[PDB]
Enzyme design. Structure first.
Site, PDB file in Angstrom:
ATOM      1  N   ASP A   6       0.850  -1.005  -0.026  1.00  0.00           N
ATOM      2  CA  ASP A   6      -0.114   0.167   0.150  1.00  0.00           C
ATOM      3  C   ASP A   6       1.078   1.667  -0.365  1.00  0.00           C
ATOM      4  OD1 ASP A   6      -2.240   1.587   0.827  1.00  0.00           O
ATOM      5  OD2 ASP A   6      -1.489   2.230   2.409  1.00  0.00           O
ATOM      6  N   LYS A  67       2.408  12.044  -3.602  1.00  0.00           N
ATOM      7  CA  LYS A  67       1.033  10.668  -4.043  1.00  0.00           C
ATOM      8  C   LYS A  67       0.379  12.307  -4.443  1.00  0.00           C
ATOM      9  CE  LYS A  67      -1.978   6.904  -3.635  1.00  0.00           C
ATOM     10  NZ  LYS A  67      -2.367   6.458  -1.724  1.00  0.00           N
ATOM     11  N   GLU A 171      -7.442   0.536  -4.356  1.00  0.00           N
ATOM     12  CA  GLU A 171      -7.228   0.466  -2.728  1.00  0.00           C
ATOM     13  C   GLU A 171      -9.013   0.220  -2.003  1.00  0.00           C
ATOM     14  OE1 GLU A 171      -6.366   4.403  -1.246  1.00  0.00           O
ATOM     15  OE2 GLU A 171      -4.268   4.167  -2.366  1.00  0.00           O
ATOM     16  N   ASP A 195     -12.667   5.392   4.112  1.00  0.00           N
ATOM     17  CA  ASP A 195     -11.399   5.178   3.931  1.00  0.00           C
ATOM     18  C   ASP A 195     -11.687   6.567   4.750  1.00  0.00           C
ATOM     19  OD1 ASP A 195      -8.999   4.994   4.506  1.00  0.00           O
ATOM     20  OD2 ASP A 195      -8.235   3.962   2.394  1.00  0.00           O
TER      21      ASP A 195
HETATM   22  N1  LIG Z   1      -5.825   3.590  17.280  1.00  0.00           N
HETATM   23  C1  LIG Z   1      -5.653   5.069  16.405  1.00  0.00           C
HETATM   24  N2  LIG Z   1      -6.390   5.617  16.680  1.00  0.00           N
HETATM   25  C2  LIG Z   1      -6.956   7.428  16.339  1.00  0.00           C
HETATM   26  N3  LIG Z   1      -5.740   7.333  15.026  1.00  0.00           N
HETATM   27  C3  LIG Z   1      -5.073   6.537  14.497  1.00  0.00           C
HETATM   28  C4  LIG Z   1      -4.684   5.280  14.784  1.00  0.00           C
HETATM   29  N4  LIG Z   1      -3.353   4.931  14.643  1.00  0.00           N
HETATM   30  C5  LIG Z   1      -3.049   5.728  13.528  1.00  0.00           C
HETATM   31  N5  LIG Z   1      -4.144   6.625  13.571  1.00  0.00           N
HETATM   32  C6  LIG Z   1      -4.775   7.515  12.453  1.00  0.00           C
HETATM   33  O1  LIG Z   1      -4.389   7.508  11.116  1.00  0.00           O
HETATM   34  C7  LIG Z   1      -3.384   8.224   9.998  1.00  0.00           C
HETATM   35  C8  LIG Z   1      -3.103   7.646   9.502  1.00  0.00           C
HETATM   36  O2  LIG Z   1      -3.908   6.868   8.285  1.00  0.00           O
HETATM   37  P1  LIG Z   1      -3.320   5.995   6.997  1.00  0.00           P
HETATM   38  O3  LIG Z   1      -4.559   5.354   6.373  1.00  0.00           O
HETATM   39  O4  LIG Z   1      -1.949   4.834   7.973  1.00  0.00           O
HETATM   40  O5  LIG Z   1      -2.167   6.273   5.814  1.00  0.00           O
HETATM   41  P2  LIG Z   1      -2.624   7.317   4.685  1.00  0.00           P
HETATM   42  O6  LIG Z   1      -4.039   7.429   5.016  1.00  0.00           O
HETATM   43  O7  LIG Z   1      -2.228   7.740   4.078  1.00  0.00           O
HETATM   44  O8  LIG Z   1      -2.775   5.102   4.226  1.00  0.00           O
HETATM   45  C9  LIG Z   1      -2.324   9.056  11.092  1.00  0.00           C
HETATM   46  O9  LIG Z   1      -2.858  10.148  10.629  1.00  0.00           O
HETATM   47  C10 LIG Z   1      -3.363   8.512  12.805  1.00  0.00           C
HETATM   48  O10 LIG Z   1      -2.829   9.707  13.227  1.00  0.00           O
HETATM   49 MG   LIG Z   2      -4.609   4.717   3.124  1.00  0.00          MG
END
Ligand SMILES: Nc1ncnc2c1ncn2[C@@H]1O[C@H](COP(=O)(O)OP(=O)(O)O)[C@@H](O)[C@H]1O
Ligand SMILES: [Mg+2]
Length: 377
Positions: A6, A67, A171, A195
């Site tokens: 990903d 991206k 995705e 998402d």
């Molecule tokens: N346990 C959690 N509770 C709340 N927010 C979280 C937790 N773990 C990660 N996050 C948040 O999720 C976000 C990461 O999003 P992610 O989907 O991994 O990235 P992308 O959107 O680039 O794929 C970060 O901003 C982080 O702060």
């Molecule tokens: Mg994502």
């Protein structure tokens, strides 16, 4: 040994399907997701956690959000609007956008797909460290709204990194594959993907007929994610620090960065606990900042952002000519969907219907790409 990668806007993730199970691979620091950061110093090039940890000390040479530029031209209206919020330069090169930084004392420019190839190279090395073997084949995921130019530029990023991209898949489709929604033998299935990630929010409605996927509608917000929830907490604590010590820390970039990481860490705790404590030594002019925040206060600081996420959901249902009761499966994707208030809002919207969430939502895209990689290999 084929892997599923990903390539996220803020965080990337790599998994591998082997022995009838999917293994999400942690990096050298034990993190199952890696920030999509690339930093250039006068000695070395930093990718992932090492790049994000020094962004406050080297802002003009730390590249992120590549991206948002990939597959686009410099004259794009989105490109011109996004570069107004980046501390690094984005120059024009025969109509193509290129990031320009300083590396080893000289000036160097890179295309967006070259920056993403460096992130893919790190995810490639993370998989090889765990597997102990050379990784060549991979499936890379892209947003459902990506056009041919954006899908090709992502495939070129894998080729530059030395990967053999088996297939580019969506995705949200990868998330549905992760939960085996395409293996439910029966009538036509309508699947909605929710998402909510780091800086982006995507809603997708899929239709599975005889195991074949079709993208019916897409919606969301390109600038809504966990980072906006952190900024609300940062402004909250900045006003609190100013209220207690009569001093404003807004102009200290290092102090704001240290407070932002504590807010992000406290936010993750609030998904599993009803409160979290902030502990920062010598935040500003030698004053320590020790306080706490409850889950209720965190929800109140983001009440408008949380409830607003259901507007793209209604828009996606309306574009797909579907009522909410016609949705057969609901899937939570993105790390921000761990927030209990977010899950409560989406379940109440669907009148108490159970959500698919057993898989770590920030790992579900790489999970499904890993399953697809094993099928195509
Ligand atoms: N346990 C959690 N509770 C709340 N927010 C979280 C937790 N773990 C990660 N996050 C948040 O999720 C976000 C990461 O999003 P992610 O989907 O991994 O990235 P992308 O959107 O680039 O794929 C970060 O901003 C982080 O702060
Ligand atoms: Mg994502």
């Amino acid at each position: 040994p084929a892997v599923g990668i990903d390539l996220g806007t803020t965080y990337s993730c790599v998994g591998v399907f082997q022995h009838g199970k999917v293994e999400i691979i942690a990096n050298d620091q034990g993190n199952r997701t890696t920030p999509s950061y690339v930093a250039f110093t006068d000695t070395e090039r930093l990718i992932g956690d090492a790049a994000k940890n020094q962004v406050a000390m080297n802002p003009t040479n730390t590249v992120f959000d590549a991206k948002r530029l990939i597959g686009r031209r410099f004259d794009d209206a989105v490109v011109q609007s996004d570069m107004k919020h980046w501390p690094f330069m984005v120059v024009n090169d025969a109509g193509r956008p290129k990031v320009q930084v300083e590396y080893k004392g000289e000036t160097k420019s890179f295309y967006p797909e070259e920056v993403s190839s460096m992130v893919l190279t790190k995810m490639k090395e993370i998989a090889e460290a765990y597997l102990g073997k050379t990784v060549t084949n991979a499936v890379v995921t892209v947003p459902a709204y990506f056009n041919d130019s954006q899908r090709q530029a992502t495939k070129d990023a894998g080729t530059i990194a030395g990967l053999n991209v088996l297939r580019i898949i969506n995705e949200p489709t990868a998330a549905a594959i992760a939960y085996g929604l395409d293996k439910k033998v029966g009538a036509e299935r309508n699947v909605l993907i929710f998402d909510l990630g780091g800086g982006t929010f995507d809603v997708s409605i899929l239709t599975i007929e005889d195991g074949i996927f079709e993208v019916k509608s897409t919606a969301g917000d390109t600038h809504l994610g966990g980072e906006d929830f952190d900024n609300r907490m940062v402004n909250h604590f900045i006003a609190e620090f100013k209220r207690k010590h009569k001093k404003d820390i807004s102009e200290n970039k290092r102090a704001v960065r240290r407070l932002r990481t504590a807010c992000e860490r406290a936010k993750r705790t609030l998904s599993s606990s009803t409160q979290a404590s902030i502990e920062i030594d010598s935040l500003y002019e030698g004053i320590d900042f020790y306080t706490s925040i409850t889950r209720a206060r965190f929800e109140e600081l983001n009440a408008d952002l949380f409830r607003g996420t259901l507007d793209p959901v209604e828009k996606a249902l309306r574009d797909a000519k579907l009522d909410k009761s016609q949705i057969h499966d609901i899937v939570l994707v993105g790390g921000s969907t761990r927030i209990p208030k977010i899950q409560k809002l989406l379940q109440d919207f669907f009148n108490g219907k159970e959500l698919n969430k057993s898989i770590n939502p920030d790992e579900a895209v790489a999970y499904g790409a890993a399953v697809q990689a094993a099928i195509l290999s």
